Write a protein that binds this DNA or RNA. Structure first.
Lengths: 140, 140
DNA sequence: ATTTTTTAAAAAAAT
DNA sequence: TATTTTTTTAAAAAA
Protein backbone atom coordinates (compact mmCIF):
# COMPACT_ATOMS: atom_id res chain seq x y z
CA UNK A 1 0.00 0.00 0.00
CA UNK A 2 1.03 3.61 -0.61
CA UNK A 3 -1.19 5.06 2.11
CA UNK A 4 1.78 6.28 4.15
CA UNK A 5 3.30 8.24 1.27
CA UNK A 6 -0.15 9.65 0.41
CA UNK A 7 -0.74 10.93 3.96
CA UNK A 8 2.81 12.29 4.01
CA UNK A 9 2.15 14.26 0.82
CA UNK A 10 -1.22 15.44 2.16
CA UNK A 11 0.55 16.93 5.20
CA UNK A 12 3.30 18.37 2.97
CA UNK A 13 0.58 20.24 1.05
CA UNK A 14 -1.25 21.43 4.16
CA UNK A 15 2.03 22.81 5.50
CA UNK A 16 2.61 24.69 2.21
CA UNK A 17 -0.69 24.89 0.23
CA UNK A 18 -1.07 26.08 -3.35
CA UNK A 19 -3.87 26.22 -5.94
CA UNK A 20 -2.86 22.77 -7.21
CA UNK A 21 -2.65 21.04 -3.82
CA UNK A 22 -5.97 19.18 -3.96
CA UNK A 23 -5.50 18.29 -7.60
CA UNK A 24 -2.12 16.72 -6.87
CA UNK A 25 -3.56 14.80 -3.92
CA UNK A 26 -6.41 13.46 -6.06
CA UNK A 27 -3.91 12.31 -8.69
CA UNK A 28 -1.65 10.61 -6.14
CA UNK A 29 -4.62 8.83 -4.55
CA UNK A 30 -5.88 7.70 -7.96
CA UNK A 31 -2.52 6.29 -9.03
CA UNK A 32 -2.34 4.38 -5.74
CA UNK A 33 -5.88 3.05 -6.04
CA UNK A 34 -6.81 4.82 -2.80
CA UNK A 35 -10.28 6.32 -2.47
CA UNK A 36 -10.04 9.91 -3.69
CA UNK A 37 -12.93 11.26 -1.62
CA UNK A 38 -11.53 10.06 1.71
CA UNK A 39 -8.07 11.35 0.72
CA UNK A 40 -9.45 14.83 0.08
CA UNK A 41 -11.56 14.70 3.26
CA UNK A 42 -8.38 14.13 5.25
CA UNK A 43 -6.65 17.05 3.51
CA UNK A 44 -9.49 19.33 4.52
CA UNK A 45 -9.76 17.99 8.08
CA UNK A 46 -5.99 18.36 8.50
CA UNK A 47 -6.13 21.93 7.18
CA UNK A 48 -8.78 22.81 9.76
CA UNK A 49 -6.90 21.11 12.57
CA UNK A 50 -3.72 23.07 11.83
CA UNK A 51 -5.74 26.28 11.54
CA UNK A 52 -7.26 25.52 14.95
CA UNK A 53 -3.83 24.89 16.44
CA UNK A 54 -2.68 28.32 15.23
CA UNK A 55 -5.77 29.89 16.79
CA UNK A 56 -4.65 28.23 20.02
CA UNK A 57 -1.28 29.97 19.98
CA UNK A 58 0.70 27.47 17.93
CA UNK A 59 1.80 23.84 18.19
CA UNK A 60 3.99 24.35 21.26
CA UNK A 61 1.39 26.47 23.05
CA UNK A 62 -1.25 23.86 22.18
CA UNK A 63 0.63 20.71 23.22
CA UNK A 64 0.88 22.20 26.71
CA UNK A 65 -2.49 23.94 26.95
CA UNK A 66 -5.34 22.48 29.00
CA UNK A 67 -6.86 20.85 25.92
CA UNK A 68 -5.93 17.22 25.30
CA UNK A 69 -7.75 16.85 21.98
CA UNK A 70 -9.70 19.24 19.76
CA UNK A 71 -13.01 18.16 18.24
CA UNK A 72 -11.59 18.51 14.72
CA UNK A 73 -8.49 16.59 15.84
CA UNK A 74 -10.66 13.62 16.85
CA UNK A 75 -12.57 13.79 13.57
CA UNK A 76 -9.18 13.67 11.82
CA UNK A 77 -8.07 10.77 14.02
CA UNK A 78 -11.10 8.68 13.06
CA UNK A 79 -10.69 9.45 9.35
CA UNK A 80 -6.98 8.60 9.41
CA UNK A 81 -7.38 5.25 11.15
CA UNK A 82 -10.31 4.36 8.90
CA UNK A 83 -8.51 5.02 5.61
CA UNK A 84 -5.35 3.25 6.80
CA UNK A 85 -7.29 0.20 7.98
CA UNK A 86 -9.05 0.00 4.61
CA UNK A 87 -5.56 0.02 3.10
CA UNK A 88 -4.75 -3.05 5.20
CA UNK A 89 -2.47 -1.41 7.76
CA UNK A 90 -2.18 -2.93 11.22
CA UNK A 91 -3.34 -0.83 14.16
CA UNK A 92 0.10 -0.64 15.81
CA UNK A 93 1.58 0.54 12.52
CA UNK A 94 -1.09 3.21 12.07
CA UNK A 95 -0.52 4.64 15.55
CA UNK A 96 3.21 4.80 14.81
CA UNK A 97 2.77 6.34 11.33
CA UNK A 98 0.44 9.16 12.44
CA UNK A 99 2.55 10.04 15.47
CA UNK A 100 5.52 12.20 16.40
CA UNK A 101 7.70 9.16 15.60
CA UNK A 102 6.96 9.44 11.87
CA UNK A 103 4.55 11.56 9.82
CA UNK A 104 3.63 13.82 12.72
CA UNK A 105 0.07 14.25 11.40
CA UNK A 106 -0.75 14.66 15.12
CA UNK A 107 1.46 16.20 17.86
CA UNK A 108 0.90 12.96 19.75
CA UNK A 109 2.79 9.79 20.66
CA UNK A 110 1.65 6.40 19.30
CA UNK A 111 0.10 5.55 22.69
CA UNK A 112 -1.82 8.82 22.99
CA UNK A 113 -3.21 8.10 19.54
CA UNK A 114 -3.99 4.42 20.11
CA UNK A 115 -5.47 4.74 23.62
CA UNK A 116 -7.70 7.57 22.38
CA UNK A 117 -8.72 5.64 19.27
CA UNK A 118 -10.06 2.81 21.41
CA UNK A 119 -11.77 5.08 23.93
CA UNK A 120 -13.46 6.73 20.95
CA UNK A 121 -14.59 3.35 19.58
CA UNK A 122 -15.80 2.22 23.02
CA UNK A 123 -17.65 5.53 23.29
CA UNK A 124 -15.89 6.40 26.55
CA UNK A 125 -15.34 9.83 25.03
CA UNK A 126 -17.26 11.93 22.52
CA UNK A 127 -16.22 13.74 19.35
CA UNK A 128 -15.68 17.10 21.05
CA UNK A 129 -12.88 19.05 22.72
CA UNK A 130 -11.39 16.86 25.46
CA UNK A 131 -9.77 18.70 28.38
CA UNK A 132 -6.59 17.45 30.06
CA UNK A 133 -7.93 16.07 33.34
CA UNK A 134 -5.58 16.36 36.31
CA UNK A 135 -4.49 13.32 38.33
CA UNK A 136 -4.88 13.04 42.10
CA UNK A 137 -7.45 12.19 44.75
CA UNK A 138 -10.82 13.90 44.49
CA UNK A 139 -11.55 16.56 47.11
CA UNK A 140 -13.59 15.41 50.12
CA UNK B 1 6.19 36.71 60.54
CA UNK B 2 7.24 38.75 57.51
CA UNK B 3 8.94 35.86 55.72
CA UNK B 4 6.44 35.93 52.85
CA UNK B 5 7.00 39.61 52.09
CA UNK B 6 10.77 39.10 52.38
CA UNK B 7 10.79 36.25 49.85
CA UNK B 8 8.49 38.28 47.61
CA UNK B 9 10.94 41.20 47.66
CA UNK B 10 13.87 38.83 47.08
CA UNK B 11 12.19 37.58 43.89
CA UNK B 12 11.28 41.15 42.90
CA UNK B 13 15.00 42.01 43.06
CA UNK B 14 16.13 38.89 41.19
CA UNK B 15 13.67 39.75 38.42
CA UNK B 16 15.09 43.30 38.21
CA UNK B 17 18.50 43.44 39.97
CA UNK B 18 20.48 46.58 40.77
CA UNK B 19 23.64 47.44 42.71
CA UNK B 20 21.55 47.97 45.86
CA UNK B 21 19.54 44.75 45.65
CA UNK B 22 21.43 42.76 48.28
CA UNK B 23 21.73 45.74 50.57
CA UNK B 24 17.97 46.28 50.50
CA UNK B 25 17.35 42.59 51.16
CA UNK B 26 19.72 42.63 54.15
CA UNK B 27 17.91 45.66 55.55
CA UNK B 28 14.46 44.12 55.09
CA UNK B 29 15.59 40.87 56.73
CA UNK B 30 17.13 42.78 59.64
CA UNK B 31 14.00 44.85 60.29
CA UNK B 32 11.95 41.65 60.29
CA UNK B 33 14.33 39.83 62.61
CA UNK B 34 14.96 37.21 59.93
CA UNK B 35 18.44 35.73 59.58
CA UNK B 36 20.32 37.90 57.09
CA UNK B 37 22.70 35.21 55.89
CA UNK B 38 19.97 32.75 54.91
CA UNK B 39 18.03 35.59 53.25
CA UNK B 40 21.02 36.49 51.07
CA UNK B 41 21.73 32.81 50.35
CA UNK B 42 18.22 32.49 48.92
CA UNK B 43 18.71 35.61 46.78
CA UNK B 44 21.83 34.08 45.29
CA UNK B 45 20.33 30.61 44.83
CA UNK B 46 17.27 32.16 43.17
CA UNK B 47 19.47 34.23 40.86
CA UNK B 48 21.30 31.08 39.73
CA UNK B 49 18.08 29.14 39.27
CA UNK B 50 16.61 31.83 37.01
CA UNK B 51 19.89 32.05 35.10
CA UNK B 52 19.75 28.28 34.61
CA UNK B 53 16.16 28.48 33.38
CA UNK B 54 17.21 31.03 30.75
CA UNK B 55 20.04 28.73 29.67
CA UNK B 56 17.34 26.09 29.20
CA UNK B 57 15.39 28.22 26.74
CA UNK B 58 13.20 30.14 29.17
CA UNK B 59 10.49 29.38 31.73
CA UNK B 60 7.99 28.02 29.20
CA UNK B 61 10.59 25.92 27.40
CA UNK B 62 11.80 24.63 30.78
CA UNK B 63 8.44 23.74 32.33
CA UNK B 64 7.87 21.39 29.40
CA UNK B 65 11.41 20.10 28.87
CA UNK B 66 12.45 16.62 30.00
CA UNK B 67 13.87 17.98 33.26
CA UNK B 68 11.56 17.88 36.28
CA UNK B 69 13.91 19.68 38.69
CA UNK B 70 17.33 21.29 38.33
CA UNK B 71 20.01 20.68 40.95
CA UNK B 72 20.07 24.38 41.86
CA UNK B 73 16.26 24.36 41.99
CA UNK B 74 16.33 21.61 44.65
CA UNK B 75 18.99 23.49 46.61
CA UNK B 76 16.67 26.52 46.49
CA UNK B 77 13.71 24.37 47.54
CA UNK B 78 15.51 23.12 50.65
CA UNK B 79 16.66 26.62 51.61
CA UNK B 80 13.18 28.08 51.16
CA UNK B 81 11.38 25.47 53.25
CA UNK B 82 14.07 25.70 55.93
CA UNK B 83 13.90 29.48 56.37
CA UNK B 84 10.09 29.47 56.31
CA UNK B 85 9.88 26.68 58.89
CA UNK B 86 12.26 28.59 61.16
CA UNK B 87 9.85 31.50 60.78
CA UNK B 88 7.08 29.24 62.11
CA UNK B 89 5.20 28.68 58.86
CA UNK B 90 3.18 25.49 58.42
CA UNK B 91 4.25 23.11 55.66
CA UNK B 92 1.00 23.42 53.68
CA UNK B 93 1.34 27.21 53.78
CA UNK B 94 4.94 27.09 52.59
CA UNK B 95 4.09 24.89 49.61
CA UNK B 96 1.31 27.32 48.68
CA UNK B 97 3.47 30.44 49.16
CA UNK B 98 6.39 29.24 47.01
CA UNK B 99 4.15 27.98 44.22
CA UNK B 100 2.43 29.24 41.09
CA UNK B 101 -0.56 30.06 43.32
CA UNK B 102 1.31 32.88 45.05
CA UNK B 103 4.93 34.07 44.98
CA UNK B 104 5.89 31.87 42.03
CA UNK B 105 9.43 31.41 43.38
CA UNK B 106 9.17 28.06 41.56
CA UNK B 107 7.25 27.27 38.33
CA UNK B 108 5.59 24.49 40.31
CA UNK B 109 2.25 23.71 41.95
CA UNK B 110 1.99 23.31 45.74
CA UNK B 111 1.85 19.51 45.34
CA UNK B 112 4.89 19.31 43.07
CA UNK B 113 6.75 21.30 45.70
CA UNK B 114 5.47 19.39 48.73
CA UNK B 115 5.78 15.87 47.28
CA UNK B 116 9.34 16.67 46.19
CA UNK B 117 10.21 18.20 49.56
CA UNK B 118 9.32 14.97 51.32
CA UNK B 119 11.04 12.72 48.78
CA UNK B 120 14.13 14.87 49.32
CA UNK B 121 13.87 14.50 53.11
CA UNK B 122 13.29 10.74 52.81
CA UNK B 123 16.31 10.60 50.50
CA UNK B 124 14.28 8.98 47.73
CA UNK B 125 15.91 11.50 45.42
CA UNK B 126 19.26 13.29 45.43
CA UNK B 127 20.22 16.95 45.08
CA UNK B 128 20.85 16.76 41.34
CA UNK B 129 18.96 17.27 38.09
CA UNK B 130 15.85 15.06 38.17
CA UNK B 131 14.50 13.94 34.78
CA UNK B 132 10.77 13.68 34.07
CA UNK B 133 10.22 9.92 34.10
CA UNK B 134 7.52 8.65 31.76
CA UNK B 135 4.56 6.60 33.01
CA UNK B 136 3.61 3.20 31.61
CA UNK B 137 4.52 -0.47 31.87
CA UNK B 138 8.19 -1.35 31.60
CA UNK B 139 9.26 -3.09 28.39
CA UNK B 140 9.48 -6.90 28.57
C1' DA C 1 3.83 16.95 59.93
C1' DT C 2 4.53 12.99 57.09
C1' DT C 3 2.88 8.92 54.63
C1' DT C 4 -0.28 6.58 51.76
C1' DT C 5 -3.96 6.26 48.65
C1' DT C 6 -6.34 7.65 44.58
C1' DT C 7 -6.84 9.30 40.05
C1' DA C 8 -5.66 10.18 35.09
C1' DA C 9 -2.75 9.54 31.34
C1' DA C 10 0.59 7.10 29.06
C1' DA C 11 3.10 2.79 27.87
C1' DA C 12 3.15 -1.80 26.94
C1' DA C 13 1.80 -6.40 28.39
C1' DA C 14 -2.11 -9.49 28.38
C1' DT C 15 -5.91 -11.43 26.22
C1' DT D 1 -3.11 -8.91 15.18
C1' DA D 2 -7.23 -6.36 17.44
C1' DT D 3 -8.81 -4.85 21.81
C1' DT D 4 -8.61 -4.79 26.85
C1' DT D 5 -6.23 -4.59 31.08
C1' DT D 6 -2.38 -3.83 33.91
C1' DT D 7 1.47 -1.17 35.37
C1' DT D 8 4.04 2.85 36.27
C1' DT D 9 4.76 7.80 37.34
C1' DA D 10 3.46 12.13 38.87
C1' DA D 11 0.24 14.90 40.94
C1' DA D 12 -3.52 15.82 44.30
C1' DA D 13 -5.46 15.28 48.54
C1' DA D 14 -6.97 12.09 52.10
C1' DA D 15 -5.21 9.36 55.86
Amino acid sequence: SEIRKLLQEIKKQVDNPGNSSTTEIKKMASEAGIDEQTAEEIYHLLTEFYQAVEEHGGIEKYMHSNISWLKIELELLSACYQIAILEDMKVLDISEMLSLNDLRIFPKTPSQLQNTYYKLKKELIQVEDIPKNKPGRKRK
